[PDB]
Amino acid sequence: SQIRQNYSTEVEAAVNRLVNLYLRASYTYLSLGFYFDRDDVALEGVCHFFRELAEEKREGAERLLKMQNQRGGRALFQDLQKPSQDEWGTTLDAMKAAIVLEKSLNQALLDLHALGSAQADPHLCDFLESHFLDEEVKLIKKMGDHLTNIQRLVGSQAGLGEYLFERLTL
Amino acid sequence: SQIRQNYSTEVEAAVNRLVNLYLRASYTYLSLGFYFDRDDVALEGVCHFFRELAEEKREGAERLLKMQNQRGGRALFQDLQKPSQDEWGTTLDAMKAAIVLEKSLNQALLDLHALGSAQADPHLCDFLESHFLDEEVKLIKKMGDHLTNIQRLVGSQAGLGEYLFERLTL
Amino acid sequence: SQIRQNYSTEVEAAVNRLVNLYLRASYTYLSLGFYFDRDDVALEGVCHFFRELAEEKREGAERLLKMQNQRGGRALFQDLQKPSQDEWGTTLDAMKAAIVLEKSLNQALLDLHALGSAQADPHLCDFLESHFLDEEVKLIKKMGDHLTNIQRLVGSQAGLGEYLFERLTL
Amino acid sequence: SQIRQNYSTEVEAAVNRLVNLYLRASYTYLSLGFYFDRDDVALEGVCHFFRELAEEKREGAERLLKMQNQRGGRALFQDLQKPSQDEWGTTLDAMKAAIVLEKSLNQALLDLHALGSAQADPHLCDFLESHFLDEEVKLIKKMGDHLTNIQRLVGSQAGLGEYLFERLTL
Amino acid sequence: SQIRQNYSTEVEAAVNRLVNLYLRASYTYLSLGFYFDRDDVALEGVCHFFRELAEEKREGAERLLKMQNQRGGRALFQDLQKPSQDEWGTTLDAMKAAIVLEKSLNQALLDLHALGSAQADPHLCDFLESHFLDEEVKLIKKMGDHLTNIQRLVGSQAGLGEYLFERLTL
């Protein structure tokens, strides 16, 4: 590219892989959202929590793609793997799966940051620090807060706690 | 009628029967609403849910009657059977009876649509698709969502769950 | 009932019978309204006059039911008899049937008031005097005014008078 | 056409024929409107009723033509036959001719709907149900209401009734 | 009195006794309100419910006194007995005591109405029907609704139900 400067093939490829990870996460959240909209699940606040995350992950992918083009790299898309489950269990099961998913995205961001640092690519490092690393830390903290509250609500009567958390937190 | 065109005696009669079904459903909901207003039942959100449905069903009957006259058919009214119960039990019992009632109305709409299609009456088919079929599907989905939430709230202590659902959902 | 005080079984039963009378009157007015909406009758102001009365009678039934529950009585619903006619003739015939209907409702209110007085139930007597007795007298006077005007318009050419009354009074 | 999909030559031709019918109806209404504007006829409300219908029919033709192009069919225009009369008689004669005209348009819509159904063309069927079938039913009902009122006004003194209907309904 | 007309000594005395009953009820509610404000009771919505009733009962006494003077009777005040308890137990115990209190006031109103009727004092009868009888019926119905909800919340864990009712109803 006429514009490409200080942008390694290693980072370009890692950015494409990260786009796939974010789009896969968006797909997972789409599935989680619609599962909580089933008439036999019926937890509206949980559906809305995950549908909003599906949008956030798609937006992250789009920001990565815009950056790929700003740097002169070339977007390459791969198949998007279906989500790991068809049914997602309780809100507790879903929130545990979500935190696993976000930790995996955060680890991929940290890996890319390390690659950027190894490649002496400070534009990349700034980009991740600005738009991604803090968002992930904030989201993971929120999910951990939710997991703690969901868990405190189980002990006695799980259906009651599940309803209350959806009504009063989400 | 000077205006009647492509409107079978079969559809005319079925529309009169459907008006009776909607008015009967309105009556059932009136009874459900006032039962939840009893001082020894006292669930205001449940009363309001059913009173609003009584109004919706009456409005459906009125829309059918307006259509009967637009097509040149003749409204014929029959006695309105009293509702199937005098006392309606818990919110769970009432919501189960309501879903049974709406499924019966939906089946009567589907039957009328099939008759319209057999009679090559596309105005009828459009009328039902526009003002009735989607409303029924949406309402049945809402009731199923409510039934799932009511059921999740029972397990432990039924009075507590009944209060919470009325306070926090309805 | 934990709340019931000075409320006789006789009044409770009479209130249920009165609810049936008001709902039947509402049904009669629904039928009158839709008859005047027929393309071969086509008197819009007459349809609107009766449709508004159908709503007023339903509201009266609902006020009686609310009162039944306020006093600790128990609503009991019976079948609703179909209206006395399928076709209602001229505006004059319909207005005569309406005044007969309202006089019958007024007589049932007066009977209930007499029962309340015999049962020393001043809350009932106030309730009827406040929300029902004056409304009936006002409505009967209006219908008598209409009957006089309709009758003055017949003599010559009945179709002309029927049109003029609908256009210029209703 | 590069865009044409599931659009039969039979429907394309029937749509062109229907455009001709709507434009002919518009022409008929133009003639009716100007007849009622003659100084020796002089019924302004009747002129305005028909002039508004001339505009509605032209708009229907234009909507059909837009649809023809959306589907990749080709508009073909034919001569427009002059209206069936040069003078239109009384308002009663004109309203009878109008209802005959609208019933013929409605029958052509129903025929086209049947053809669409035979051709498995649901876009066509939706298009007619949405923009045409209900409009025709509503208009025919209005004309039948008018015919009933005009007829009730004749009996006695026809000029008087004709004036009153124009003044007080139209 | 120069103004006194048709106002019996029996009614005058009964009105003074009724003022004492209303002021005593106001005192009882003052005590109930402050008990629920104790740091070891601490149910704010219950305190506010009873403090508002203390004000309503005082206002009722003041309306009776204004009426006594309008009729030319003479207000006579007696000692006000302290409330029947110093501590009021749970919200359920308090609401049961409140309904007992209101039923006693309602019975005193009904007795006074009967005396008015025996004395042929229609001004008195109107006064009670207008400002007192309906208010009592409405209040008793509300308290019965509350008692039903409190009772449904006990079964399982009484502290939890007591908190929830205060938070979500009052």
UniProtKB/Swiss-Prot annotation, chains A, B, C, D, E:
Disulfide bonds: none
Matching CDD domains: Ferritin (cd00904)
Keyword Nucleus part of the UniProt annotation: no
GO cellular-component term (any): ferritin complex
Localisation: Cytoplasmic vesicle, Autophagosome; Cytoplasm; Autolysosome
All copies of domain Ferritin-like diiron, residue ranges: 5-154
Keywords for the protein's UniProt record, in alphabetical order: Acetylation, Cytoplasm, Cytoplasmic vesicle, Iron, Iron storage, Lysosome, Metal-binding
Ranges that cross the membrane: none
Record-level GO BP terms: intracellular iron ion homeostasis; iron ion transport
GO terms assigned for molecular function: ferric iron binding; ferrous iron binding; iron ion binding
Span list, region Catalytic site for iron oxidation: 52-59
Positions with a binding annotation for Fe cation: 52, 55-56, 59, 62
InterPro entries named among the record's database cross-references: Ferritin, Ferritin-like, Ferritin-like_diiron, Ferritin-like_SF, Ferritin_CS, Ferritin_DPS_dom
Function: Stores iron in a soluble, non-toxic, readily available form. Important for iron homeostasis. Iron is taken up in the ferrous form and deposited as ferric hydroxides after oxidation. Also plays a role in delivery of iron to cells. Mediates iron uptake in capsule cells of the developing kidney. Delivery to lysosomes by the cargo receptor NCOA4 for autophagic degradation and release or iron.
Subunit structure: Oligomer of 24 subunits. There are two types of subunits: L (light) chain and H (heavy) chain. The major chain can be light or heavy, depending on the species and tissue type. The functional molecule forms a roughly spherical shell with a diameter of 12 nm and contains a central cavity into which the insoluble mineral iron core is deposited. Interacts with NCOA4.
Family in the record: Belongs to the ferritin family.
Miscellaneous note of the record: In horse spleen the light chain is the major chain.
Protein name: Ferritin light chain
UniProt source species: Equus caballus
Organism classification: Eukaryota, Metazoa, Chordata, Craniata, Vertebrata
